[PDB]
Design a protein around this ligand. Structure first.
Ligand SMILES: [Cu+2]
Ligand SMILES: [Cu+2]
Ligand code: NI
Length: 311
């Protein structure tokens, strides 16, 4: 999309509402597969609610976009290489845009709580650029995300339950290496409404479930080699005190000359499942994480689909 110039990144929509435009500061990439990061401080200090996102991406040029909330961006820079890092504190993902898979909108009444004494103070925008051909004219790029904000407290609060591995090791050439993650859910009821999967080049399939009374209810299952958007949850799923959250990533070792562990770089791996949920405002909590496998044996009775790659 076009660069902002004189009009500025902030448009008031109403007394309470306003739109914030988060855009690359006229960047020109020089190599393939480049990853650019930038930040915007929230213009208000008081608690606000992120209630809608617009993609402003030049269709020919961008592979994916990601927006985070965090309090300490990795750079004071105008922009920077995301390989350097997104946030020093916890980067809370709010939005994912992908090319061949258009995002679905937040349910009405559901909003991310930001700012205030406790919420995110900064947005961080990650723009993955793919084919650099369109930059034959050396032109500046200003792609990114417009964001709808409000002071009106939402009845439902969006959050993230991040499941990720930490201890996986993928022996070179090993047919199948399973990364299991499991945690017992201890908060008020959450309703999952979307998921994103993330591995690096070695993941084959990723599946997350809710287990209750020993029975596996599918949250999401995706090929991580496909565009890694937030996908809608087919039938919405309540997770309740007592339930166990379980995810498995299937990896291969074939193609690799050396062992592969969890890490930041492309020659390392990751097994992340992002469960986007919403809760009743008065109960709600913005982020939860599982980096353990508390019920390893329970995986014996995992459904078989969690082990076969999608059609
Ligand atoms: Cu991408
Ligand atoms: Cu990664
Ligand atoms: Ni329900």
């Amino acid at each position: 999309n076009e660069c902002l110039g004189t009009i500025g990144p902030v448009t008031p929509l109403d007394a309470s509402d306003f739109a914030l435009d988060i855009r690359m500061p006229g960047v020109t990439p020089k190599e393939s597969d480049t990853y650019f990061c930038m930040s915007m401080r929230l213009p208000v200090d008081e608690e606000a609610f992120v209630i809608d996102f617009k993609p402003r991406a030049s269709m020919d040029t961008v592979h994916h976009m990601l927006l985070f909330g965090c309090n300490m961006p990795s750079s004071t820079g105008s922009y920077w290489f995301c390989d350097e890092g997104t946030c020093t504190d916890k980067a809370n993902i709010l939005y994912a845009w992908a090319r061949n898979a258009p995002p679905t909108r937040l349910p009405k009444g559901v909003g991310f709580r930001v700012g205030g004494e406790t919420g995110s103070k900064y947005f961080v925008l990650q723009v993955h650029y793919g084919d650099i051909s369109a930059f034959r004219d050396n032109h500046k790029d200003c792609s990114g995300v417009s964001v709808h904000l409000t002071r009106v407290p939402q009845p439902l609060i969006a959050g993230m339950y991040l499941m990720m591995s930490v201890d996986t090791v993928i022996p070179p050439g090993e047919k199948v290496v399973n990364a299991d993650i499991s945690c017992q859910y201890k908060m008020y009821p959450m309703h999952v409404f979307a998921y994103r999967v993330h591995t690096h080049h070695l993941g084959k399939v990723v599946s997350g479930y809710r287990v209750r009374n020993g029975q596996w209810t599918l949250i999401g299952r995706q090929n991580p080699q496909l565009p890694q958007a937030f996908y809608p949850v087919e039938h919405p799923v309540d997770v309740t005190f007592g339930d166990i959250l379980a995810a498995r990533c299937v990896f291969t070792g074939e193609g690799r000359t050396e062992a592969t562990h969890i890490g930041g770089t492309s020659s390392d791996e990751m097994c992340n499942l992002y469960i986007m949920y919403y809760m009743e405002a008065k109960y709600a909590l913005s982020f939860m994480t599982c980096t353990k496998n508390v019920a390893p044996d329970m995986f014996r009775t995992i459904p078989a689909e969690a082990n076969i790659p999608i059609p």
